[PDB]
């Protein structure tokens, strides 16, 4: 429930990098080159989790003798032989799945269609650079632009973490969601892939921004809720992953409330907004995907 | 770095001497070592290093498989699962017969393990309830009991020798096949079939 999703971007980033003193994650800048020239498009995919763990020889061997798994005996080396007194030392003398990481951050190279269409320069986007949080100066009027061609472009740009790109993408999404009327319904089947790609990456800020954008997407329409129910199979898994992640203070007061960093309540609010909007036969799919959810009457 | 010039080829050291007589004059003077055995050890070391540089070669590139009659039809056949075997597990002899084995041995063998003892005493029984039924239900139990010193209370379960309808033991039994009481030689009586 934020009036402006982009109204806290720069403040939060600056606070994290300087005010809090926490080390800012500076990755996925490989191949970006400089400015004023196009980024070399890497063929890597952000959504895919190309972990592919390779335990070639540290896999413990099953022991039929004793049911406990045991590591293989060490290779005897010629450098270390049997010393004089080690015989008395011998008298005087646990496996696990390696990681199977699900909560680790997935890499997201800057190869979205938003970026390309931006350095090409066919987007009518400009920054007002006002005293308040920046708006978008639209060269062409928003109501008459083609949503079928531009909406998938901007939701694919949510995944950006680079400073000049993510703000523009989020603000454009905000502007068309606020302005668009009944023309969002026919294009909503095309918007599943970018939302899923933005959700698949395990970035905290990216998840928060895409959750807020989903809330305003379902909110700022007339009957879009009844069209998102068949597509719950590709959006709700991330909600299931991060539903219970929430900070607990025994008696302290949560100060970081004006910014929506903790996604634990954000997921609950998004699931609710899914429940009221298009509530006809909607609990069944959500409960099938998320088993821990409860009805909001 | 070989001490002896033996390792190098002919024209290799010839070209070396044409280019540099400098190395060409060490590889002869490298043998200045007083002890020949030490120089032989160094030669062994350099030969061993050269061998280590080379890679191993497997000798099983062409797999050879023996064929019974050298025909694909025969080789690819798997025998059909046709068995006239008895269905009861107890009929098979998985152990030495309990009769010859010593009485106290049978007693403590029962004491550690009742189950397979009951199965050996009751070869025809197939279900757990039948084997662990009673020492008095089967008439054949009494010889085993008084051979192994197991007391049998009187009138258990009944005096009249009977009461095992499922299992075919003693005089109460009939084969499920069509010529009951056995010995079927024609189609008229069934020929031991259904």
């Amino acid at each position: 429930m934020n009036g402006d999703v982009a109204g806290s971007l720069f403040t939060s980033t600056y606070r994290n990098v300087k005010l809090a003193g926490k080390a800012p994650p500076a990755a996925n800048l490989s191949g970006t080159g400089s400015c004023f020239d196009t980024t070399s498009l890497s063929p890597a995919r952000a959504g895919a989790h190309k972990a592919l763990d390779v335990q070639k020889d540290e896999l413990p061997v099953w022991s039929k003798s004793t049911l406990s798994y045991k590591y293989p005996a060490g290779r005897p080396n010629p450098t270390g032989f049997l010393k004089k007194g080690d015989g008395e030392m011998i008298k005087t003398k646990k496996p696990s799945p390696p990681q199977a990481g699900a909560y680790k951050r997935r890499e997201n190279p800057p190869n979205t269609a938003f970026r390309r269409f931006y350095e090409r320069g066919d987007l009518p986007i400009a920054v007002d650079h006002r005293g308040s949080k920046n708006m978008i100066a639209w060269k062409v009027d928003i109501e008459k632009l083609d949503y079928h061609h531009y909406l998938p472009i901007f939701f694919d740009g949510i995944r950006e973490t680079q400073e000049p790109y993510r703000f523009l993408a989020v603000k454009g999404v905000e502007d068309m969601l606020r302005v668009g009327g009944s023309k969002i319904l026919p294009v909503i089947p095309q918007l599943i892939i970018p939302i899923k790609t933005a959700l698949n990456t395990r970035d905290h800020s990216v998840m928060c921004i895409t959750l807020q954008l989903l809330q305003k997407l379902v909110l700022s329409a007339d009957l879009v809720g009844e069209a998102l129910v068949p597509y719950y199979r590709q959006i709700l898994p991330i909600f299931n992953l991060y539903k219970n992640k929430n900070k607990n203070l025994g008696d302290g007061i949560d100060y970081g409330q004006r910014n929506y960093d903790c996604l634990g309540e954000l997921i609950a609010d998004t699931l609710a907004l899914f429940e009221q909007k298009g509530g006809d036969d909607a609990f069944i799919n959500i409960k099938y995907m998320v088993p821990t959810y409860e009805s909001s009457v | 770095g070989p001490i002896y010039p033996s390792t190098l080829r002919y024209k290799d050291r010839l070209d070396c001497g044409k280019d540099d007589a400098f190395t060409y004059n060490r590889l002869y003077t490298a043998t200045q070592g007083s002890d020949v055995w030490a120089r032989l050890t160094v030669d062994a070391s350099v030969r061993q290093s050269s061998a280590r540089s080379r890679g191993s070669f497997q000798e099983g590139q062409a797999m050879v498989r023996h064929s019974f009659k050298n025909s694909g039809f025969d080789s690819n056949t798997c025998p059909a699962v046709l068995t006239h075997s008895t269905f009861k597990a107890g009929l098979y002899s998985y152990g030495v017969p309990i009769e010859e084995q010593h009485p106290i041995t049978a007693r403590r063998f029962k004491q550690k393990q009742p189950l397979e003892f009951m199965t050996q005493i009751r070869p025809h029984t197939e279900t757990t309830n039948q084997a662990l039924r009673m020492l008095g239900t089967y008439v054949s139990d009494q010889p085993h009991a008084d051979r192994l010193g197991m007391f049998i209370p009187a009138g258990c379960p009944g005096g009249k020798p009977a009461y095992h309808p499922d299992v075919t033991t003693g005089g109460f039994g009939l084969l499920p096949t069509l010529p009951r009481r056995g010995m079927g030689a024609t189609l008229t009586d069934g020929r031991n079939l259904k």
């Binding site: - | 009659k69 050298n70 039809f73 025969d74 056949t77 025998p79 059909a80 006239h84």
Partner: protein, 113 residues
């Protein structure tokens, strides 16, 4: 001497036989007879049984057994000298009665004995 599979590569034993099959209640008949042609390859000692596909019979006819080495119910495989005419052969729980033999088979057994 040469390998068996090349000495007789196309030499094929071929016998004619039948086996009765008791059919059930029907105005047509009370029992039926199924003609079968039995093939035995001298190359790899592999059996083969097929039907001659009577014209108007409603039975699905054609090949009866895959052409493969059959195993008898008790043990060792079949032998060429176990296919006399007028004798009963037991294959896969069925009993075929050999009735007639091919001329090649006739002369081959005559040479064999």
């Amino acid at each position: 001497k040469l390998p068996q599979w090349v000495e007789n590569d196309r030499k094929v034993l071929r016998f004619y036989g039948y086996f009765k099959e008791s059919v059930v209640e029907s105005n047509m008949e009370n029992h039926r007879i199924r003609k079968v042609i039995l093939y035995y390859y001298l190359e790899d000692d592999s059996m083969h049984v097929a039907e001659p596909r009577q014209d108007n019979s409603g039975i699905p006819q054609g090949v009866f057994i895959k052409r493969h080495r059959v195993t008898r119910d008790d043990g060792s495989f079949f032998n060429p000298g176990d296919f006399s005419v007028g004798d009963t052969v037991s294959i896969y729980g069925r009993n075929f009665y050999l009735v007639d033999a091919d001329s090649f088979t006739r002369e081959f057994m005559a040479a064999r004995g």
